[PDB]
Amino acid sequence: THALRDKWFVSFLPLLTADMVNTDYKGNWQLAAQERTQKLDWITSVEELWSTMNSLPKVHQLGMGSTLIFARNNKEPPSYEAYPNGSRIMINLLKPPTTDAGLELVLAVVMGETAAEKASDGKPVCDVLRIAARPSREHSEQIRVEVWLSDSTRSHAVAEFLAEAMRAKGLAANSYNIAEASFD
C-alpha cells in the first residue's frame, strides 16, 4: 500500500516464431518485436503493480521466449541504445520460495518509491525491468529478471545490495544467481 517512483509502462512480448517474421515482417525481427508487443498500461502504485501481475498467469507460466517489460516513463519498446553509459544485472531465480521473494525484492528495489532510494544511495538509476519465463525439466518455475541501469558505475553497489538482501531473506545459495554484464 505505497507509491512507485514516477510511472512505469507495462508490456508483454511473446515468443517470436520464424515463419511469421519471414512472411509478415519480411525477416525483420526488430520490426516483428515492435508489432507483436502487447501493451498493457501505466502503473503508478503498488496496488496497480500487483493488479497488473494478478491479471496474467504466474511469471514462470508466461512462456519460454516471452518477456514482461516495465519501463519508467516510456510506453515504446525499450532499447539498449538509450543508455550509452549503462549496463545490466541478471538475476536467475530457480525455484520457490526464491522466485517469489526475489521477484518481490527486485520489483521493490527498482520501482518502489522508498525502496529505490535505499538501494541507490539516494539517486535511483534502474530504468527498465525485463522478466523472462525460463522453465526447464529440472526447474519448472525458473525465471530471469534483467535490470537495465542508466549508469554503469552504480552496478557494483546495486548488485551487492541485492546480494545482501537475498541472503537476509534466508534464501538458499543454490536457488539463485546474480551477475553483472554489459548490454553487448
**How do beta strands 126-133 and 67-72 pair?**
antiparallel
Segment holding 66, helix H or strand E? none
Q: Is 106 exposed, middle or buried (0-12, 13-18, 19+ CB in 10 A)?
A: buried
Domain boundaries in the chain?
A: 1-184
> Within its chain, how far is the Cα of 37 from the centroid?
15
Q: What is the arrangement of strands in the sheet containing 3-13, beginning at the earlier edge strand?
A: 38-45, 3-13, 67-72, 126-133, 143-149, 87-93, 176-181
> What does the alpha-carbon distance between residue 84 and residue 61 come to, in Å, rounded to a whole number?
33
Give the pairing of strands 87-93 and 176-181: antiparallel
3-state SS, residue 26: coil
What is the H or E stretch that residue 70 is in? strand 67-72
C-alpha cell at 34: 515492435
Q: What is the resolution of this structure in A?
A: 2.0
Nearest alpha-carbon partner for 53 in 8, 115, 15: 8
Question: What is the distance between the alpha carbons of residues 23 and 129, in angstroms, rounded to a whole number?
Answer: 31
Distance CA 59, CA 170 (A): 22
Method for this entry: X-ray
